[PDB]
């Protein structure tokens, strides 16, 4: 009800650097469309932007400004449309219910196949359904509910994220959208083709839990090195198999259990000897010597067999196989260090000008004040939206300069490593 | 322990963790990212479930396990999907080589020998060498993080 309070809440300020390299303060009225921006998108932009070579995030922020503007427009339209708003707001609920349904269907399938908080209450309902209707009918009802909820969830997802806004091609391009469509296809296959197809849905745990995704990132980030190490292991196995075929052929006797002799030779061809070595020596802790025939001391080839087994054990089992685990362990530390550095920068540096906290010590304006009022990335975004919306004729002095710089793709109007308060 | 049974005193031996800061710090490596460890275990369970589905569908006959009877010597362990899941989780995970150890040794003349070889090697690499080692990697990373802090 206070006019001054309303105007203060709807007024914003920024600091710009002019062509003469002097700083000025521009006070502008916040554009109306700015209020529609989502806190989720704001947090994602704050925590996801990456520094450039020079160490400034301003370039990427300016690049994403246009997507932010389009998102604001579609937020206004979505709030205009009532019914879809209710579904869009409760996006998390649909995902949680779908995950619980997938877990329950998979549990039932595992426990009964082949056949013929409100979570405890839902479990009791499922148990009563099993007791009354039967395992098959309960599974059918659960699958139908899962499919309906997944349709609701995909509609809510497209509504909330506005992927289509970029275009149909962009919507198809989005990987998360494709993951959701794959989930829908898997649910349909589970409902109609075969019940065991519901198993694939259990992979949604990786998507849901960030921690599990971070754990798998250790495998995936440097995965090329792991595959190359596996190829090295294959090469060494091939060479060992060549040696065994040439000299130690007879020792390759492997016990066999036959469906309706008790041993068979496994190194009569080089392909077979390679298969035997790769399948058995690698999996066995000791190595290929474990499967190979036990050598009597009186035999002349015992010294060669000892060296063969020990060399395989040390080269392949002890060194090569451990290199994959070493790669995973190193990837863990690399990810941890990168995360720590990014968190430190985000917490202790200004997004726009990049000045450190220590620079503001023993000064009239704190770093918190600087980020909140003097340098607010959202205030800069609001100013950009103001320049876009406002007619060219009504541009003021500073607005004309900012518009020309935007058109020329010059990002020097942002303040870099400079603040008016620190200067004076 | 005093009033019910003498074996209840065994639980008191856990006071060593309370007494010693060193052992408590060592266990803190397991506990700090216990959620990560449990999520990795759940991923292992899901992969075992999928492997059991595949084995039940195509490699059912190979699931023959020996048994000792208190007063035949082999029983089928993949007649039902729960039985197959229990067999895989209990034996393949604990065995160094994976499920191939428990599974029947295939003859080369058998048509499904390549399929069995791929099955065993895939289980070994995906589960035994990667998924299981991720828990130890998590523990080591927790060690490092605690040291840095
Ligand atoms: N340049 C910047 N450097 C560092 N942090 C920033 C910067 N600009 C904004 N932030 C932080 O981003 C978050 C978003 O700030 P915002 O103005 O939306 O705060 P709010 O308290 O939600 O808003 P309001 O008080 O106006 O309702 C806040 O943590 C703010 O400190
Ligand atoms: Ca004018
Ligand atoms: Zn600043």
Curated annotation (Swiss-Prot), chain A:
Zn(2+) binds at residues 350, 353, 370, 375. Residues 143-182 are extracellular. The modification Phosphoserine is found at residue 421. Phosphorylated by AKT1 on serine and/or threonine residues. Belongs to the InsP3 receptor family. Inositol 1,4,5-trisphosphate-gated calcium channel that, upon 1D-myo-inositol 1,4,5-trisphosphate binding, transports calcium from the endoplasmic reticulum lumen to cytoplasm, thus releasing the intracellular calcium and therefore participates in cellular calcium ion homeostasis. Homotetramer. Homodimer. Interacts with TRPC1, TRPC3 and TRPC4. Interacts with TRPV4. Interacts with SIGMAR1. Interacts with PML and AKT1. Interacts with IRAG2 (via coiled-coil domain). Interacts with CABP1. Interacts with TMBIM4/LFG4. Interacts with CEMIP. Interacts with TESPA1. Interacts with TMEM203. Interacts with BOK; regulates ITPR3 expression. Interacts with BCL2L10. Interacts with CHGA and CHGB. This is Inositol 1,4,5-trisphosphate-gated calcium channel ITPR3. The lineage of its organism: Eukaryota, Metazoa, Chordata, Craniata, Vertebrata. The gene is ITPR3. The chain holds residues 2111 to 2612 of 2671 of the full protein.
């Amino acid at each position: 009800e206070d006019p001054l309070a309303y105007y203060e809440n709807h007024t914003s300020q920024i600091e710009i650097v002019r062509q003469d390299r002097s700083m000025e303060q521009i006070v502008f009225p916040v554009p109306g469309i700015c209020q529609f921006l989502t806190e989720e998108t704001k947090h994602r932009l704050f925590t996801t932007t990456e520094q450039d070579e020079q160490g400034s995030k301003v370039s990427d922020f300016f690049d994403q400004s246009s997507f932010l503007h389009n998102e604001m427009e579609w937020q206004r339209k979505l709030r205009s449309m009532p019914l879809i708003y209710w579904f869009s707001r409760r996006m998390t609920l649909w995902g949680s219910i779908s995950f619980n349904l997938a877990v329950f269907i998979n549990i039932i399938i595992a426990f009964f196949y082949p056949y013929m908080s409100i979570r405890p209450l839902i479990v009791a309902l499922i148990l009563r359904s099993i007791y009354y209707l039967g395992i098959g009918p309960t599974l059918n009802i659960l699958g139908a509910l899962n499919l309906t909820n997944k349709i609701v969830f995909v509609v809510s997802f497209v509504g909330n994220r506005g992927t289509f806004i970029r275009g149909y091609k962009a919507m198809v391009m989005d990987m998360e959208f494709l993951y959701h469509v794959g989930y829908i296809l898997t649910s349909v296959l589970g409902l109609f083709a075969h019940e065991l197809f519901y198993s694939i849905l259990l992979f949604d745990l990786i998507y849901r839990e960030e921690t599990l995704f971070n754990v798998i990132k250790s495998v995936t980030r440097n995965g090329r090195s792991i595959l190359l190490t596996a190829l090295l292991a294959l090469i060494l196995v091939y060479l060992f198999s060549i040696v065994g075929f040439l000299f130690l052929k007879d020792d390759f006797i492997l016990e066999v259990d036959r469906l309706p002799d008790s041993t068979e030779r496994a190194c009569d061809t080089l392909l077979m000897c390679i298969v035997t070595v790769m399948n058995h020596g690698l999996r066995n802790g000791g190595g290929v010597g474990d499967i190979l025939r036990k050598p009597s001391k009186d035999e002349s080839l015992f010294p060669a067999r000892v060296v063969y087994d020990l060399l395989f054990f040390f080269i392949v089992i002890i060194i090569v196989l451990n290199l994959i685990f070493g790669v995973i362990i190193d990837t863990f530390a690399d990810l941890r260090s990168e995360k720590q550095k990014k968190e430190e920068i985000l917490k202790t540096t200004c997004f726009i000008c990049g000045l450190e906290r220590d620079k503001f010590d023993n000064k009239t304006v704190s770093f918190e004040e600087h980020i909140k009022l003097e340098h607010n990335m959202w205030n800069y975004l609001y100013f950009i939206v103001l320049v876009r919306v406002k007619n060219k004729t009504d541009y003021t002095g500073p607005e004309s300069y900012v518009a020309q710089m935007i058109k020329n793709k010059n990002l020097d109007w942002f303040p870099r490593m400079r603040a008016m308060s620190l200067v004076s």
